[PDB]
Amino acid sequence: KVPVVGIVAALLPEMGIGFQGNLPWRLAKEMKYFREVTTLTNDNSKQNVVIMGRKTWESIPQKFRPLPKRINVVVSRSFDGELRKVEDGIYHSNSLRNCLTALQSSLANENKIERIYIIGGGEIYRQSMDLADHWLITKIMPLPETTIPQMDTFLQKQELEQRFYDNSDKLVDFLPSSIQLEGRLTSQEWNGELVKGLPVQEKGYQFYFTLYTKKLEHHHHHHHH
């Protein structure tokens, strides 16, 4: 019942997302978007979940984790069970898939989770293409005189474009109501590809907030008893 949304910032055209265990850039306006989207809810009695891999957890500055006002879930194969409270605001899971099933139980969550955000990293995102209902992707482009940063971790763009379509026309309506964005919806060609979303510029980069949604599926089978 709860939507599952991957959220990621990726550098075009390869969709690079990391280098040596960290982000390849430091963009406050992008972090602000990430913070506001994952924190805010339409219903004030609910919170969102943020699920992340162990390495991504380790990348967040210690003074800023667990991420405030969101239920944090860290997944590691060395953890105990599918969903265990380990500290205030922190759950541990040994399974991305089982943790999502556990988080979907209305008995366990009392319908007080609005959305489940998958917040990284590379290995987690690879496993999330068949799990997410949507992707919020910030598409980042170095401006003309900007050096392309070195990167060693990438979003699976092939799998994304196979399963999802660019639904950025509906981004504004998809985001929590109280969020405010500066830019207006724009379509721009960049190194061949069509980039559509809400634009921002910061330091040496231009970036677009985009929304990807699952493509329509044929009706092949519905389980009957």
Ligand SMILES: NC(=O)C1=CN([C@@H]2O[C@H](COP(=O)(O)OP(=O)(O)OC[C@H]3O[C@@H](n4cnc5c(N)ncnc54)[C@H](OP(=O)(O)O)[C@@H]3O)[C@@H](O)[C@H]2O)C=CC1
């Ligand atoms: N640009 C962006 O938007 C974002 C980028 N990133 C970047 O990604 C990089 C980190 O990504 P990556 O190295 O792939 O690491 P991840 O953050 O994906 O963590 C991988 C770890 O998660 C655990 N894990 C993976 N799959 C499962 C599963 N199915 N069940 C249980 N545990 C699982 C394992 O932990 P263990 O080894 O303990 O078993 C594994 O080593 C960094 O550079 C980071 O900055 C991260 C978030 C956002």
Ligand SMILES: COc1cc(-c2ccccc2)ccc1[C@@H](C)C#Cc1c(C)nc(N)nc1N
């Ligand atoms: C080092 O990486 C972080 C630092 C911080 C953080 C928070 C407060 C102060 C400094 C860093 C928050 C989240 C992250 C990670 C988990 C992220 C992210 C993320 C970002 C930043 N943007 C988008 N669009 N999607 C995402 N998943």
Ligand SMILES: [Cl-]
């Ligand atoms: Cl945050």
Ligand SMILES: [Cl-]
């Ligand atoms: Cl799993």
Ligand SMILES: [Cl-]
């Ligand atoms: Cl697995």
